[PDB]
Every structure is written in C-alpha cells, then in structure tokens.
Design an enzyme around this catalytic site. Sequence first.
Site, PDB file in Angstrom:
ATOM      1  N   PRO A  35       0.997  -1.157  -0.064  1.00 24.53           N
ATOM      2  CA  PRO A  35      -0.069   0.004  -0.038  1.00 24.53           C
ATOM      3  C   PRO A  35       0.761   1.224   0.045  1.00 24.53           C
ATOM      4  O   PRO A  35       1.751   1.170   0.410  1.00 24.53           O
ATOM      5  CB  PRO A  35      -0.662  -0.109   1.116  1.00 24.53           C
ATOM      6  CG  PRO A  35       0.062  -1.080   2.143  1.00 24.53           C
ATOM      7  CD  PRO A  35       0.781  -1.914   1.345  1.00 24.53           C
ATOM      8  N   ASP A  36       0.190   2.142  -0.680  1.00 25.94           N
ATOM      9  CA  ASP A  36       0.984   3.483  -0.487  1.00 25.94           C
ATOM     10  C   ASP A  36       0.414   4.266   0.561  1.00 25.94           C
ATOM     11  O   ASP A  36      -0.732   4.691   0.693  1.00 25.94           O
ATOM     12  CB  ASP A  36       0.800   4.326  -1.837  1.00 25.94           C
ATOM     13  CG  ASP A  36       1.159   5.647  -1.806  1.00 25.94           C
ATOM     14  OD1 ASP A  36       1.002   6.465  -0.648  1.00 25.94           O
ATOM     15  OD2 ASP A  36       2.135   6.125  -2.785  1.00 25.94           O
ATOM     16  N   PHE A  37       1.268   4.889   1.548  1.00 26.91           N
ATOM     17  CA  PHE A  37       0.744   5.292   3.015  1.00 26.91           C
ATOM     18  C   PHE A  37       0.128   6.747   2.626  1.00 26.91           C
ATOM     19  O   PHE A  37      -0.818   7.070   3.360  1.00 26.91           O
ATOM     20  CB  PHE A  37       1.930   4.977   3.969  1.00 26.91           C
ATOM     21  CG  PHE A  37       3.163   6.251   3.610  1.00 26.91           C
ATOM     22  CD1 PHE A  37       3.270   7.416   4.433  1.00 26.91           C
ATOM     23  CD2 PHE A  37       3.915   5.964   2.528  1.00 26.91           C
ATOM     24  CE1 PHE A  37       4.325   8.416   3.935  1.00 26.91           C
ATOM     25  CE2 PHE A  37       4.876   6.852   2.311  1.00 26.91           C
ATOM     26  CZ  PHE A  37       5.310   8.045   2.823  1.00 26.91           C
ATOM     27  N   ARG A  38       0.572   7.026   1.692  1.00 24.87           N
ATOM     28  CA  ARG A  38       0.279   8.570   1.084  1.00 24.87           C
ATOM     29  C   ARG A  38      -1.011   8.591   0.729  1.00 24.87           C
ATOM     30  O   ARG A  38      -1.982   9.614   0.709  1.00 24.87           O
ATOM     31  CB  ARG A  38       1.071   9.193   0.254  1.00 24.87           C
ATOM     32  CG  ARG A  38       2.599   9.399   0.837  1.00 24.87           C
ATOM     33  CD  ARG A  38       3.590   9.729  -0.385  1.00 24.87           C
ATOM     34  NE  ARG A  38       3.021  10.000  -1.722  1.00 24.87           N
ATOM     35  CZ  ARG A  38       3.465   8.930  -2.622  1.00 24.87           C
ATOM     36  NH1 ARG A  38       4.134   7.702  -2.227  1.00 24.87           N
ATOM     37  NH2 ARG A  38       2.878   8.906  -3.686  1.00 24.87           N
TER      38      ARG A  38
END
Lengths: 274, 274
Positions: A35-38
Amino acid sequence: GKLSLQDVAELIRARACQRVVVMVGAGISTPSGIPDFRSPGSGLYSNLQQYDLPYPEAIFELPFFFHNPKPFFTLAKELYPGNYKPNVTHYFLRLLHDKGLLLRLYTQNIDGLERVSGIPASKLVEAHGTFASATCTVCQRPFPGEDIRADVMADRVPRCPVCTGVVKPDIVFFGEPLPQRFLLHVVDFPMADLLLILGTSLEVEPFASLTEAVRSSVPRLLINRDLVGPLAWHPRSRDVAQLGDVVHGVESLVELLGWTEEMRDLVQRETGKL
Amino acid sequence: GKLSLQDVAELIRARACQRVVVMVGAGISTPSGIPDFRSPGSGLYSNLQQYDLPYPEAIFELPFFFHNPKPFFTLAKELYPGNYKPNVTHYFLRLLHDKGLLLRLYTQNIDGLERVSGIPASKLVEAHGTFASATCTVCQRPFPGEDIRADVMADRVPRCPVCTGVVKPDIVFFGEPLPQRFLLHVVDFPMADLLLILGTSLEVEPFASLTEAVRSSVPRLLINRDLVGPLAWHPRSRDVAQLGDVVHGVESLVELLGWTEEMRDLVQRETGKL
Ligand SMILES: [Zn+2]
Ligand SMILES: [Zn+2]
C-alpha cells in the site's frame, strides 16, 4: 531512428547486450499489494490517521522520528520481512540474473522483495536501505533485523539492550547519505550495455540523475506509467518507453524475450511458499 | 635504524620529501585557549553545567540534540568564527603550505583555525565539518554560517525561514558519515612522501586508521603528548615521536627546518588582527 520494445528484445536475444543495469521504484511493488501510505484506502493509511502526521514524508524525517517514533514503526510493522511476496516483475529480474544478464540491480524500494525473490546481495544495491539490519540511534550499535522483530510486531518501540536508545532500522531518512554500496554506480554505469528502468518516477536524488551516467549509445528502456525525469526532458535517440501498467510491460518483454514458460515455472516454484 | 626529529628535518631540507600529508587534533588548538568542554575550569564548562548533560559527548548526538538543541548551541557560540585565533602550530602548517610542501591537511577540529590562518580550502579536509555553513534539519535547505550568527550570539536556536525547522551547523555528529571530501584520502595517502601527526590521540574512526594507509617506507612523525593509537601498537621503523608539549615540538622542528625568523615574521603580520 527510434528503437522499439521488440528491437530491444532482439538485441538481448542476438546477445548484443550482455551487461544490463536495472533501476527500480515503488511501481514494481504495487502488484504485490504493498500500500502507498500517502493514499487513503489501505489499513496502513488508517493506522497512520491516528498520529495526525503534518504530511506523510514526516515518516522519513529524523526530527519527526525522534519526536515520535511510532508513525514510522507502524510502517515497519507493515513492511517487515515475511508479510508480502515478490510479484512477477521481481522474478523477471531474478530470471534475468540466472541467465547471466544482470550487472547490477539498483532499488529505491525498502520492501526487500528483490532479495526475497532470490537475487543475491552482491548483485543488489538497496539505495534506500533495508529492514534486514538496524542501528542504535545513540551508541551506533548494529543489530540484525530479527533482533527487533518481537518489538515491532507487538507495537513496542525497539530499545537498545546496552544504552536504552531507540534502535532504528537502517532505512535512509531525508538528507541522510545513501549507503556506501551506492558507490558502485561509478564502475557499473560506464560498464552497462543496456539500462532498464522500471516502475519509478525519478523524483529522488541522487538516484534520479543516474539515468544520465550511461554511454550515449546505451539504449535506455523505461517501463512505467508515464514518461518522466531525465528521460522525458533530455531524450536520447536510443531511448524506449513502454508506457502502461508495469506488469503488462514486463509480460510483453518477457514473451518477446522468449521466456514465458520458464518464467511461469520459476514463479510457481518460487511463489510456492504461500 | 630509527630516524630522529633532526633526520626528518634533514629529509625536508635535502628535498627528499616534497609531498607532506598532515593530520591534526584538539591538541593543536589548546594553545589558542580553546577550552575542553569535558574539563572543569572554563566558562564553557560552567555554562554547560546548567543543562545537566548525562555525559558530555551528548553534545554531538542527534537524539540528544533534537531533545534539547541548547547544550550544543552554547558550544557553537563559544567556537563561532571570530572568537579565537590560530596559534603558532597553525601558522607552521600555513608556512609549510606557502613553501610548496602541503599535499593535504586533515583536521578533526571544528574551530576553523586552519582556514583562519590562511591555508586554502582546496588543501584542507575538515573531517568533522565546519561552522562555515548549515543545513535545516527538516527540509535540508543549506545556509551560509553567517545567516544564523545573530541567532547563535543571542542564544536563540536558529530556525528555518522556509519550514521553521531547527537549522544545524554542518558539524558531524556521532554515527554520521564524514563529509565527501574525506574521500581524497584514497588518492592522498598513497601519494604522500611524509606523514605528519600533530596533537591528536587517534581515538576517532575512521580517521584514526588513516595513519596506516601510507606506503611502508613513508616516515610517520608524531608530535603529541604521548605515543598512541596505531603508532603505539603497530610501530613501523620509519616512525618518529616528538613527545612533549605540541608547541615546543613544532618550535624545535621549525628551527631544525631553518624557518624560525620567517615564521615569527609571518605570525606577527598574521596574528596582527588582535
Ligand atoms: Zn545503544
Ligand atoms: Zn527548513
């Protein structure tokens, strides 16, 4: 005139290239489900919502880390070895290594999937570090990654057994220098006969300007969502861009290379631990 | 058999050595009156007593710096350019440079007196950094040293004008890598025909093991209070030790070199701004 994907496939097949340097980013790990934390959506992002980061990159800044080490350690729990698997794009690199073609793999990712896919440490440069080891922030005492695992899986901040300082994984934060092995680029890039760029946006120095250190007759092949960084704005005429989903770019290259069945069989075996 | 100070003087005079690399420590700055913060007596030490450091080296640790940046900034106010002057030992190095003998000066000191004494930046390696410039700890924005001076002389912590982070002088803290110019040792040390070591205890890596990177027939002259580090426990037979006060060691060497009057006249002129 402009080469095509197919032409590059042909160069490799005719053994006109035998010394491939590869540079990879976050784009090659998305398909493993990292997952992209942003980005809202993931449970990593939700778990980050409780710290109220002023902005997401704070996760990789020292001043914010020493103020509150938990945002970062939430991420480490998410990414620690064992949780995610390599995708086809990793095993294609592995295949490229087992066929004698890999001079060096430079990664900006810290998920560790290149070594998990079985590419040897000597061919890898983890330009942004690794969770495989850690350093005490006060006495600079080094520890293997598994020594702080119990702490990270249980959500305790890992503390030093000798001085009680906070033990930090050897990930490169902002303004820190890249690791020493990054100096291989000096021998590696003048020696390359092919440059492969995969799943990156070329927005992080000094790794970005590396696309520029190959001899001018060295074809630079980009498999990425869009044209970007050096390659978009200082085009050379041996440049090639497979734009689209990275995995479908790799699958087409793999097929043009003639490696499909061998790749499937390699991945079945390998991804076998699931 | 063992060379003497006088023999070394003779080698330089006969122009058998023309390529001198010098390594210096805190021992060469004591005579300019620069206080040792670890030592009671000075007003630097007293001003530090109010922060109750757990131990003095905390001044150079990041985790302690971000917890409380004032201990360190007390030190910077003490050492900032303009407050102290170079001693004779500095001007002897300067003289050595003006006579064509200096390949490179490596310093562990951060007091800046080598450049103040007029030795050019291109011949210096400040292995532990410098107050001449600074970096914002959050956005990595670089600033000249005089931009944070008003803040440091007035005892305010310097803050970034763009992001408000704490601006830190480009001094190397514990566990940080040395600056890039430190890589000159790779060309410099195989090229040296004489190695000069002055006022250091050789207890800080990787600078310590540098005494080991000269060719075996290269005489290594130590002017220091005692025998120490590599030179005490891996003696080579071109080693030479002038033990005693560093300044009286330098004065004797200077006289054996034949440079006394020229040195006095250089220092009068130079130390003239007093
Ligand atoms: Zn520790
Ligand atoms: Zn800033």
